[PDB]
Each structure stands twice: as C-alpha cells, then as structure tokens.
C-alpha cells in the first residue's frame, strides 16, 4: 500500500487499537480523511454472537453525534427560508402558541440556552403526546439565552420544528433530503430490513447485546446510524462545503458559525468550535462534567477565531463515537464503536493521530 496508507495504519494501530482490550470493546471503525483521500481501519466484531467482523458496510449508532445531522437539517431549512433562527417554536408547532416555551427562539433551542431544559426529559415523559404536554407546561427559570445546559429535549424540539417547517417527518427530512444531499448511501434514522445484517449490536457493561429502543423526540438527539465510509463523506462535506450544491453548502456553512463562547469553547450548531491549534487540555475541558452536566453562563462573541477546528463526542456513557476536523489542514477523523469508551480516551487518541500525520 501507499506510504500514507502504512503511516496512517500505524498511527491508528498505536493510538486506537489498544482501547479495544482496555475497555473490552467488540468492534471499532476508525477513519481519516486527508486531502480528499480516505483511510479506513476496521477492528473486531460487529456482532459477537454471529462472529460478524466489522467492515465497510457495518452500521454503527452515532448517538449524540446525530445532533450534527439535526444541525445540518436546521441550517438547510434556515437557508431555504423555511425558518428563521429568531422564530419561536409555536410558529410551527401550533399547540405551543401562547405558552412560555414560545418565548424561546430556535437558535436558543438548538444551542441549549432556554434556561430550563436538562440533559434528558423527566422519566415520566415517555410518549409523543407527553412530550407535547411537557412543552406546554414548561416555564422558564434562568434568563433565556444566558446559560448553556446541554440538553436532548432542547435540540429535540429544534429538530421537531425543523421537520414541521419542511412539511415532513424528521426521519424523512434526513433520509430523503439531507443524507442524499451529503452523498450518504447507508445512513439511517430507521435501519431497513435489508440492512439489519449490517447493523452492529451494541454492548452494555455486562457485554450483553442491546438494541436501542427509541425515546420520545429521540431521533434529533441520538437517532442516526451510519457507516464509516458515510461518516468520512460527511467529514469531507464539512471540510469542502464549497464543492457541494448551494442548498447543502449553505446548510453546512451555517453549522460552522460560532454562536457564543463558554471559556475556550465556541458553540456552533451541533459542532463545538475551537481556535486552532487547540491544546489537548482545551479539548478535554470541553468534555468536563462542568460543561456537559451543569449550566454555564455564555458570552456573546465579537468575532469567531481566525483559524478554527471542530469536534463532537457521543455520550461518554454510551459507545465510542467521536468526530473532529481541521479545515486549514484539510483533515478529519471519525471513530465508531459498539461499546463504551470514555470520551477523554476518544479525544486523546484522535489528538495524537492528527498531531502526528505528515502533510
């Protein structure tokens, strides 16, 4: 193989492969894209019980990386004029008109600043009807727009509004509009029967196979499944949006604009944004308990960093998804697994690889 193939294989073997034994992870896919060249490394098993090895067709759960597709869908709708980020949700979900949540705008929902939405819905909110009742009954707490609290309900409501503005269900927004515009072939909200043999099982801490059961309004927060080649195409689109037709190009660019700052992290749509180079500590700090689990006051931005990079983790207690890209270096990395790996390990391994790859 090419010298670049061998160099990148060695770096991934050195930095990602040891995580498999350390965390007893059945399967992993790691990809690098550099200058429109893709490098794919597959390890282990998609299904332990079937002894099916991970391969280029293996579909993994993206978990919280799904929010990047919700963000792209929102950027797409905004740039088609179907929504404005200054709108409020009751303009689209009419049952929310004349309720307190209709005082929060769509950008605030997308970027977690409503001031009273936690990581998850309350346990008793289990059905679509109950989600609507929850939002009708909601009242504000913190000054709207001033505090970031990472929140699945918040971006879930944003995704629902995006779908309503496009006159189709959220799963169809992604599967019929967004995924095709990004050139993705095996990315799904609902995996079809003809692809179930490619759909990796997840594994809990007892190494038992588990298959996600959907939660209400879950798809925009954590409901996307994809392959390594598709995720490398997605990173390519984020690195080279100018090469794509206007509607999706504008959508991608919309997700790259920082909207406010918390310490050294800038919150874009879905993506977290940093000045490049970001120190390893800066990247780790973005994943701290303080940032992920607690409210943090935001600061308006005067201007975005001059040179930028972006990342997004899955949940640290779910599996092992992580994506990162650096526009100036025309490079990005994707990691997918079917077993929990701490987010700090994902960030550290990707940092080592991207810092070592030759130009």
GROMACS .gro file of C-alpha atoms in nm, residues 172-319:
model
  148
  172UNK     CA    1  -3.785   1.185   0.610
  173UNK     CA    2  -3.604   1.519   0.629
  174UNK     CA    3  -3.282   1.326   0.691
  175UNK     CA    4  -3.343   1.020   0.473
  176UNK     CA    5  -3.497   1.197   0.170
  177UNK     CA    6  -3.330   1.541   0.177
  178UNK     CA    7  -3.022   1.577   0.397
  179UNK     CA    8  -2.849   1.239   0.360
  180UNK     CA    9  -2.884   1.239  -0.023
  181UNK     CA   10  -2.756   1.596  -0.047
  182UNK     CA   11  -2.447   1.486   0.151
  183UNK     CA   12  -2.396   1.183  -0.077
  184UNK     CA   13  -2.457   0.930   0.200
  185UNK     CA   14  -2.569   0.581   0.098
  186UNK     CA   15  -2.607   0.386   0.424
  187UNK     CA   16  -2.708   0.642   0.685
  188UNK     CA   17  -3.046   0.597   0.850
  189UNK     CA   18  -3.285   0.705   1.118
  190UNK     CA   19  -3.463   0.370   1.077
  191UNK     CA   20  -3.242   0.086   0.953
  192UNK     CA   21  -3.434  -0.107   0.683
  193UNK     CA   22  -3.477  -0.483   0.697
  194UNK     CA   23  -3.234  -0.529   0.407
  195UNK     CA   24  -2.959  -0.365   0.618
  196UNK     CA   25  -3.020  -0.538   0.953
  197UNK     CA   26  -2.742  -0.788   0.880
  198UNK     CA   27  -2.504  -0.487   0.867
  199UNK     CA   28  -2.635  -0.320   1.184
  200UNK     CA   29  -2.391  -0.366   1.471
  201UNK     CA   30  -2.523  -0.473   1.807
  202UNK     CA   31  -2.435  -0.250   2.097
  203UNK     CA   32  -2.292  -0.400   2.414
  204UNK     CA   33  -2.358  -0.294   2.772
  205UNK     CA   34  -2.109  -0.314   3.058
  206UNK     CA   35  -2.209  -0.680   3.102
  207UNK     CA   36  -2.115  -0.733   2.734
  208UNK     CA   37  -2.474  -0.828   2.650
  209UNK     CA   38  -2.610  -0.728   2.307
  210UNK     CA   39  -2.854  -0.437   2.329
  211UNK     CA   40  -3.057  -0.265   2.057
  212UNK     CA   41  -3.166   0.096   2.126
  213UNK     CA   42  -3.526   0.143   2.194
  214UNK     CA   43  -3.637   0.488   2.074
  215UNK     CA   44  -3.738   0.752   2.323
  216UNK     CA   45  -3.985   1.031   2.256
  217UNK     CA   46  -3.834   1.302   2.036
  218UNK     CA   47  -3.518   1.092   2.038
  219UNK     CA   48  -3.425   1.092   1.671
  220UNK     CA   49  -3.288   1.451   1.650
  221UNK     CA   50  -3.087   1.397   1.969
  222UNK     CA   51  -2.938   1.049   1.921
  223UNK     CA   52  -3.121   0.855   1.648
  224UNK     CA   53  -2.886   0.837   1.347
  225UNK     CA   54  -2.696   0.525   1.237
  226UNK     CA   55  -2.418   0.530   0.977
  227UNK     CA   56  -2.115   0.354   0.830
  228UNK     CA   57  -1.752   0.461   0.839
  229UNK     CA   58  -1.741   0.546   0.465
  230UNK     CA   59  -2.053   0.760   0.501
  231UNK     CA   60  -1.910   0.940   0.803
  232UNK     CA   61  -1.589   1.013   0.610
  233UNK     CA   62  -1.805   1.157   0.330
  234UNK     CA   63  -1.980   1.371   0.592
  235UNK     CA   64  -1.643   1.499   0.714
  236UNK     CA   65  -1.542   1.565   0.352
  237UNK     CA   66  -1.854   1.780   0.311
  238UNK     CA   67  -1.765   1.973   0.627
  239UNK     CA   68  -1.406   2.024   0.504
  240UNK     CA   69  -1.508   2.126   0.148
  241UNK     CA   70  -1.861   2.270   0.153
  242UNK     CA   71  -1.783   2.491  -0.149
  243UNK     CA   72  -1.775   2.178  -0.368
  244UNK     CA   73  -2.139   2.097  -0.297
  245UNK     CA   74  -2.465   2.233  -0.442
  246UNK     CA   75  -2.580   2.555  -0.282
  247UNK     CA   76  -2.862   2.432  -0.058
  248UNK     CA   77  -2.646   2.183   0.132
  249UNK     CA   78  -2.333   2.401   0.109
  250UNK     CA   79  -2.520   2.683   0.283
  251UNK     CA   80  -2.651   2.436   0.541
  252UNK     CA   81  -2.303   2.302   0.622
  253UNK     CA   82  -2.155   2.652   0.649
  254UNK     CA   83  -2.440   2.752   0.882
  255UNK     CA   84  -2.335   2.477   1.126
  256UNK     CA   85  -1.979   2.615   1.141
  257UNK     CA   86  -2.068   2.962   1.273
  258UNK     CA   87  -1.994   3.000   1.643
  259UNK     CA   88  -2.293   3.142   1.827
  260UNK     CA   89  -2.143   3.220   2.170
  261UNK     CA   90  -1.843   3.129   2.387
  262UNK     CA   91  -1.802   2.931   2.710
  263UNK     CA   92  -1.436   2.959   2.819
  264UNK     CA   93  -1.227   2.827   2.526
  265UNK     CA   94  -1.520   2.652   2.355
  266UNK     CA   95  -1.747   2.814   2.097
  267UNK     CA   96  -2.091   2.659   2.050
  268UNK     CA   97  -2.181   2.625   1.683
  269UNK     CA   98  -2.489   2.438   1.556
  270UNK     CA   99  -2.421   2.083   1.676
  271UNK     CA  100  -2.044   2.120   1.644
  272UNK     CA  101  -1.821   2.253   1.916
  273UNK     CA  102  -1.569   2.501   1.774
  274UNK     CA  103  -1.220   2.599   1.892
  275UNK     CA  104  -0.935   2.820   1.786
  276UNK     CA  105  -0.678   2.605   1.602
  277UNK     CA  106  -0.445   2.472   1.729
  278UNK     CA  107  -0.645   2.373   2.036
  279UNK     CA  108  -0.441   2.242   2.323
  280UNK     CA  109  -0.529   1.893   2.439
  281UNK     CA  110  -0.648   2.043   2.769
  282UNK     CA  111  -0.888   2.276   2.584
  283UNK     CA  112  -1.042   1.980   2.403
  284UNK     CA  113  -1.065   1.777   2.726
  285UNK     CA  114  -1.214   2.075   2.911
  286UNK     CA  115  -1.499   2.092   2.658
  287UNK     CA  116  -1.598   1.743   2.778
  288UNK     CA  117  -1.572   1.818   3.150
  289UNK     CA  118  -1.856   1.739   3.387
  290UNK     CA  119  -1.894   2.114   3.438
  291UNK     CA  120  -1.954   2.177   3.067
  292UNK     CA  121  -2.158   1.864   2.991
  293UNK     CA  122  -2.380   1.839   3.300
  294UNK     CA  123  -2.420   2.188   3.451
  295UNK     CA  124  -2.539   2.532   3.340
  296UNK     CA  125  -2.266   2.772   3.228
  297UNK     CA  126  -2.302   3.142   3.151
  298UNK     CA  127  -2.241   3.217   2.783
  299UNK     CA  128  -2.058   3.518   2.642
  300UNK     CA  129  -2.153   3.682   2.313
  301UNK     CA  130  -1.880   3.667   2.055
  302UNK     CA  131  -1.722   3.971   1.896
  303UNK     CA  132  -1.565   3.764   1.619
  304UNK     CA  133  -1.503   3.396   1.564
  305UNK     CA  134  -1.150   3.258   1.596
  306UNK     CA  135  -0.938   3.339   1.293
  307UNK     CA  136  -0.841   2.973   1.239
  308UNK     CA  137  -1.088   2.709   1.351
  309UNK     CA  138  -1.138   2.342   1.426
  310UNK     CA  139  -1.445   2.145   1.531
  311UNK     CA  140  -1.538   1.828   1.715
  312UNK     CA  141  -1.834   1.637   1.858
  313UNK     CA  142  -1.842   1.345   2.102
  314UNK     CA  143  -2.108   1.090   2.166
  315UNK     CA  144  -2.217   1.044   2.525
  316UNK     CA  145  -1.928   0.937   2.749
  317UNK     CA  146  -2.150   0.662   2.894
  318UNK     CA  147  -2.285   0.531   2.561
  319UNK     CA  148  -2.044   0.385   2.300
   0.00000   0.00000   0.00000
